[PDB]
Design a protein around this ligand. Structure first.
Ligand SMILES: Nc1ncnc2c1ncn2[C@@H]1O[C@H](COP(=O)(O)OP(=O)(O)O)[C@@H](O)[C@H]1O
Ligand SMILES: Nc1ncnc2c1ncn2[C@@H]1O[C@H](COP(=O)(O)OP(=O)(O)O)[C@@H](O)[C@H]1O
Ligand SMILES: Nc1ncnc2c1ncn2[C@@H]1O[C@H](COP(=O)(O)OP(=O)(O)O)[C@@H](O)[C@H]1O
Ligand SMILES: [Mg+2]
Ligand SMILES: [Mg+2]
Ligand SMILES: [Mg+2]
Lengths: 371, 16, 371, 371
């Protein structure tokens, strides 16, 4: 039979059968209970709208993501999300399909063990396998080397790989991602008068960020230009009218990636954690990693980031090496495409964690040889 | 015990 | 049929059919298992890369030479190296070709006996013969007398020969060679800030030594000059950028040959063990040995050694004798060229150790008349 | 007058007048500029808190050590640290006191020359002398032979000495030390959910390592026991509550010393570099070095290391030799006690580098006879 390539993510759940080009169903991972009282009788009001249904009734819900930073903080809601994904968005019972979840690097063990225990006890799948979210993104590019920066919505991690041999001592995981950029944008919009507070209006700020923000090639020059002319002010129409005008908030929101001091984080930007991740590698594979830097994940879709990052790394790196940044147009679904490719391989067909194996060793089987 | 990948043959840079 | 003139050496395996000018395949003798985990499935990752293949993937391997000082310390790896040499670099099955290995003087017997046992049982050659590495280097020079200093990469030995009669009581074998010079260079580079530790970076230090180091004609004057001017500082680009500048480390690394007290060895340099080897000879053949001093082996390729050695010996020797140092441009492959010449001789064709002879007397046949 | 026995170290600066038992002032060597904005006026906020003052205001600072691995990477900060040490922790002007710095073996020359130039030009001491950090630790034990393993916080080096004659060709310097163990502990704590990222929280992880970690006598048995029972889980209270429970992270952090493959380092553990350092020595002083193995430095204070190391060396060494490991209770300050003893000697009183000598030969005097 065919395998189910699910990809929990944090912000958008992407799923679909193995062997295709794009995920079959992509929908936000939010579960929102209603918060008001409700007076109409017999309206058929449910107790929790999940997935894309709660992005249409969000006016009277309190949306809450079940995955904070890669890790899962609310297991009941995550189980509800998985149940919805299997039964309503794909309509395939899990009793007859292997599953291939994905997990960020350096995550707590208990999260992974609970994930496999749920998949084997509640949904009762035949066999499931958990894979690191960066190796798949490297599969999708058709490479076999390269250092991949997978800046998702929950957590940004940077896994270097050479000739198929991952370097476990050079993984640099940073917890700045799309959600913190949404919060920072929502916080700097208040400097013009627009106040978004409700958890429903966070979605509106996210839409503003997606449609308007861009990464500046040079920060100081853009700050000077936006403060003199008015060629940058782009307007946007809220879900009820009252258009708003975003000035130099456009390139200040995604600039947080390269200067995490804006949101008070100490660490260095995504332009310098990649160079540090390279320098921890051996001295003889640094040229190949320099030449095959891969971008993935949703948050790396800002217009103009593949040039800013290249300029920064070229500034840091030695002058002789060639710096090349692979930015495929299908960046958002790169991890899932790689997952489909991996699940479609014949050599991989014996790596699944078969159910009888789980019955013999318990949920701690995932840390064992079947990784 | 780390997961030791079994013995495969190919492929690369073609399905892409 | 044609004979296979293999030459194990220590650092570079040189092989080729008898009767040519240069070895057909020359490649480092290193066998390196991978050391990291490896996440890509189906990449076709082998368990041990040998020869020149492991000098390209050395970034994720742990290279380890199977021959320490002439002697062989790891027989399985040496068998692997031989198998590679026969089947992939020459592509001739050994069942139809005589072999002519080479061995340093004064080596343990068990090494030679195990070598012949392997060649007769595993590879199943028709007949093999083991020859001393210095007599061949004397063949290649077209001489018949002379004292040859064969400073390889494993061990430096100094065999005097007159009129074809070797003098077994005058062989002076010293264990300082190219590998110790590489280690000493890697140890003195730390005085400027460059630290090379990994077994892969030993190859980089070896490349630095080959391309930059030279032997000073007079040591104290060079030490004084390099400490005042800056005309010696030559720069070199690492495999990733970050050029380095070598100062007076240039002529201090190969100076260890003439002053083995630098690496803590007690013995006298290669300039004085040759004179001692001569003085042990009879009083009537010392003039001929003085006039026909032969250099061979890789490590004698330093620019300016054929003058320093001549100056030193002229200082030691009596003033009347003429001191001449033969330094052919084809020094590195001198032993193998001599091996080809010896294997191509008709008079030598009945000295091979035929397989039936080995079957009758066991591996101890090599010490017998068939030397 | 009295001499100042300073000891820069890397992680804790230890200083005090010559002739006492313990250093007068011991304080971390960190210089931390404030990173936030600061709104209270007239609060008397300085621009850099050094020493033990920045371990109390570390909540709003960005601490950065000025000494990375023995070598000094930030000379201005090191000058600030020295100025603080002289004027505020000892309150003795340096114009009237000789100084005795300490330096790791095999360090770059420029570091030592800059150190002496600073001490003679800025602080203007009467005379200063630089000594190798292992000879002092051998002084403090009251021995005159023995091989000392001085596993500090920056770099671990292993200097063998016999009858007062140091063996320069047998020094094995390895760059794994306490700081790498702190980073590895901070990296494996993430497997339970505790994430420490800020440079201030590195201090908290260091405190956890000091108070809880211990070296296992046998690694596999401990790994098996900690995975079945729960007798090892020791809890610890963070600086704000929320106690944490450390499981088998307790003996896995300091195990990196004996298996440097955990943090990706190639080299062999501290149990095998000592045996290699011994085997490079001459054949007649190996028994004495076996019997007088000395431990020093801070990182050798783990509970249970003097037994694990003895077991390992006894496994490696020949069965007849007696292996004894000297582990004095005053291990941490052993180098400084030895420094005090050396500075208090009458025979040593003429080895100082007098200022007029520096004026005549420049900073390069340190490499000369006055070592
Ligand atoms: N076109 C876009 N431009 C800018 N940001 C985007 C765009 N699309 C998505 N994002 C950001 O990326 C996030 C989605 O990232 P995604 O890759 O789905 O995360 P995950 O790894 O959890 O799947 C969204 O929250 C959004 O903030
Ligand atoms: N051009 C060169 N200049 C200086 N040193 C060299 C040069 N070529 C080789 N060497 C040294 O000689 C060694 C090779 O010696 P070789 O003669 O191959 O040893 P063997 O006798 O085992 O074949 C290398 O390890 C290198 O250190
Ligand atoms: N009681 C202890 N237990 C375990 N580790 C310790 C202990 N005390 C200090 N350390 C480690 O040793 C380091 C201090 O080493 P130290 O000897 O001061 O280095 P230096 O040689 O630079 O003075 C600290 O960073 C800490 O990690
Ligand atoms: Mg993702
Ligand atoms: Mg040779
Ligand atoms: Mg110390």
């Amino acid at each position: 039979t065919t395998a189910l390539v699910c990809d929990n993510g944090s912000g958008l759940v992407k799923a679909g059968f193995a062997g295709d080009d794009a995920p079959r169903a992509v929908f936000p991972s939010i579960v929102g209970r209603p918060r008001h009282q409700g007076v109409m009788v017999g309206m058929g009001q449910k107790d929790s709208y999940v997935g894309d249904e709660a992005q249409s009734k969000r006016g009277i819900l309190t949306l809450k993501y079940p995955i904070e930073h890669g890790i899962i903080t609310n297991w009941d809601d995550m189980e509800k999300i998985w149940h919805h994904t299997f039964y309503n968005e794909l309509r395939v019972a899990p009793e007859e399909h292997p599953t291939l979840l994905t997990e960020a690097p350096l995550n707590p063990k208990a999260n992974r063990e609970k994930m496999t225990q749920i998949m084997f006890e509640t949904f009762n799948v035949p066999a499931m396998y958990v894979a690191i979210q960066a190796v798949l993104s490297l599969y999708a590019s058709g490479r076999t080397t390269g250092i991949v920066l997978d800046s998702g919505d929950g957590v940004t991690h940077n896994v270097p790989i050479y000739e198929g041999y991952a370097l476990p001592h050079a993984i640099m995981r940073l917890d700045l991602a799309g959600r913190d950029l949404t919060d920072y944008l929502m916080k700097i919009l208040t400097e013009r008068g627009y106040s978004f507070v409700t958890t429903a209006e966070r979605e509106i700020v996210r839409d503003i960020k997606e449609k308007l923000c861009y990464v500046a090639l040079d920060f100081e020059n853009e700050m000077a230009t936006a403060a003199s002319s008015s060629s940058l002010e782009k307007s946007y129409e809220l879900p009820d009218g009252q258009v708003i005008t975003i000035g130099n908030e456009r390139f200040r929101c995604p600039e947080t990636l390269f200067q995490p001091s804006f949101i008070g984080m100490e660490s260095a930007g995504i332009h310098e954690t990649t160079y540090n991740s390279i320098m921890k590698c051996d001295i003889d594979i640094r040229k190949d990693l320099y030449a095959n830097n891969v971008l993935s994940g949703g948050t790396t879709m800002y217009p103009g980031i593949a040039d800013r990052m290249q300029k920064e790394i070229t500034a840091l790196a030695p002058s002789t090496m060639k710096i090349k940044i692979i930015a495929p147009p299908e960046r958002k679904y790169s991890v899932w495409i790689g997952g489909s490719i991996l699940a479609s391989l014949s050599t991989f067909q014996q790596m699944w964690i078969s159910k009888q194996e789980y019955d013999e060793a318990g949920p701690s089987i995932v840390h064992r040889k079947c990784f | 015990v780390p997961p030791k990948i079994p013995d495969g043959e190919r492929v690369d840079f073609d399905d892409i």
